Design a protein around this ligand. Structure first.
Ligand SMILES: *[C@H](O)[C@H](C[C@@H]1CCNC1=O)NC(=O)[C@H](CC1CC1)NC(=O)[C@@H](NC(=O)OCc1ccccc1)C(C)C
Ligand SMILES: *[C@H](O)[C@H](C[C@@H]1CCNC1=O)NC(=O)[C@H](CC1CC1)NC(=O)[C@@H](NC(=O)OCc1ccccc1)C(C)C
Lengths: 306, 306
């Protein structure tokens, strides 16, 4: 028992991190087969930054303008190309540590692990969610761009995130591995705002089930509700709407605890309306929303990875 | 910016995890050089559990009674011995993935990453602290014993924890890698209690500095205090005493933020005495106590590992 913000083991991803340096700029790259993926703004100088044209900046570049370093080994860049906001540096050496992977694009509400890196070296790993406003609440300093987010499926690393930028509420924006930003953000040093966030309701309910599974029951209740009356409460408290597929996805947790989804909704309603009365759930005095239903089942059933 | 419970990258630890099976019992082992370290209660059967004598149980055993599996490769056990609550299984193959490592015994308040494993396969990674009562608030299921806790320091893995058991408040007890438990606990299926826990004051203060560094300032105040008057407040609220060594350890954070340690204590005072008034700090509605001062500097300065 117990419930922790648990990341995926990071070893298959650590073997893919390299350092990419162009001019006066260093960041991280992801080296899969004979391609290094990294944020295209590596080609940017500090004055290019306010409104760059990357197409013009890239055609100005030669393969030798890119220092790609895999620890204390320099990879020779033998080609390059830009796909949306990511650079793809073809190198003459395929990564012998390449795991089974794919590139996936995740949905808001979905979670992933981030392997925060600087100079191609892993600094730490932590669990994130794609917020409904397509930001993530990460921990990223200068140098961290090109660090990636990922999930694992038995042996397969699903890369879903590459870090690009920090917005002024201290939240973070990035792309999938095809270079397309999550949300309306662009890789420009121009004023941009995240927009109002909402709480991921299906994740809160999943975390309440996690709580019951670990014997934390003080919040439940006799009552039930309908999907419609619950969702009218979600409106008031800036919770995202609960769908039937959300209900359907909570079924397994519902079946293991014997608490109907709509009963858990009734408990969430009373928590929303009255607060927690100085109590905690799973060690938090806030309703936690970056655990998906799968996160809860994985952690409470001990799914492993090879 | 931002602040997350960050674990160390788990790659070098994943390369040492194996499965150990003796009789009807499977748990995890740690394979370093030609030795596999695991909980000695692997030699236990469902009736030995209650009051076991491990030195009779081990002399009963032969090398062939131990199935050590490193993925889909069985290691031959060529010798065995018991060091306190750990078995050392001598095998004929040295782990080629052995990192630079060292066995450390940590102090309460210190943090570490846990790589939770089942059947020798990693399930996830998360950050824990050694509580003042020598338990850890982990996330562990049956099968998880032998999973290890660690820190990384440049290239060197400092192993500090191996998991052994769960106590009935849902908290966990284990040993260092020399087999000595943290705390008064014994590897027997008999009634044991964790004892009253306290809050790690120095870590709360360090986390408050993390908050300031990340622009979260609402809790600060005009006031200061003395180490003695503060400690009378810590007394009431079940906070550990704050030492001058603790103040000295917080100096760098004090230096970077410009907030004297005793000024932060005055803020912590007043948070203790009034609560947070419906506000959050670094995304929590509780005062968080498993970030050490080093954790804060590492995460807020981007220290990496090779
Ligand atoms: C790459 O390592 C770095 C990561 C940042 C630095 C600190 N934490 C991070 O996550 N990324 C950048 O420096 C990017 C480069 C631009 C993406 C091309 N820039 C930023 O993250 C800046 N943010 C920014 O310009 O946001 C838009 C904005 C909003 C309001 C006012 C001005 C600009 C950072 C450095 C502020
Ligand atoms: C090893 O895989 C396993 C890990 C446990 C199982 C579930 N969560 C965990 O962390 N450890 C055990 O099964 C150990 C074996 C004994 C150490 C030899 N036993 C336990 O963890 C049990 N705990 C226990 O007996 O605590 C003492 C106690 C307290 C009160 C009443 C009776 C006993 C678990 C299974 C309850």
């Amino acid at each position: 028992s117990g419930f922790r913000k648990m990341a995926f083991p990071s070893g298959k991803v650590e073997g893919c991190m390299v350092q990419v340096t162009c001019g006066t700029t260093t960041l991280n790259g992801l080296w899969l087969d004979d391609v290094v993926y990294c944020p295209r703004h590596v080609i940017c100088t500090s004055e290019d930054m306010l409104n760059p044209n990357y197409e013009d900046l890239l055609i100005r570049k030669s393969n030798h303008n890119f220092l790609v370093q895999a620890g204390n080994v320099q990879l020779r860049v033998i080609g390059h190309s830009m796909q949306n906001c990511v650079l793809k540096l073809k190198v003459d050496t395929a990564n012998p540590k390449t795991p089974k992977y794919k590139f996936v694009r995740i949905q808001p509400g979905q979670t992933f692990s981030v392997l925060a890196c600087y100079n191609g070296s892993p600094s730490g790993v932590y669990q994130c969610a794609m917020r409904p406003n397509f930001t993530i609440k990460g921990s990223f300093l200068n140098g961290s761009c090109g660090s990636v987010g990922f999930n694992i499926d038995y042996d397969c690393v699903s890369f879903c995130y590459m870090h690009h930028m920090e917005l002024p509420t201290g939240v973070h924006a990035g792309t999938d591995l095809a270079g397309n930003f999550y949300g309306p953000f662009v890789d420009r040093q121009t004023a941009q705002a995240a927009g109002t966030d909402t709480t991921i309701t299906v994740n809160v309910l999943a975390w309440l089930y996690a709580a019951v599974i670990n014997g934390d029951r003080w919040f439940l209740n006799r009552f039930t509700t309908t999907l419609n009356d619950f969702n009218l409460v979600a409106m008031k408290y800036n919770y995202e709407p609960l769908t039937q597929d959300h209900v359907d996805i909570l079924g397994p947790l519902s079946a293991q605890t014997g608490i109907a989804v709509l009963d858990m909704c009734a408990s969430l309603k009373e928590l929303l309306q009255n607060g927690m009365n100085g109590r905690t759930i799973l060690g938090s005095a806030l309703l936690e929303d970056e655990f998906t239903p799968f996160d809860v089942v994985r952690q409470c059933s001990g799914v492993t990875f090879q």
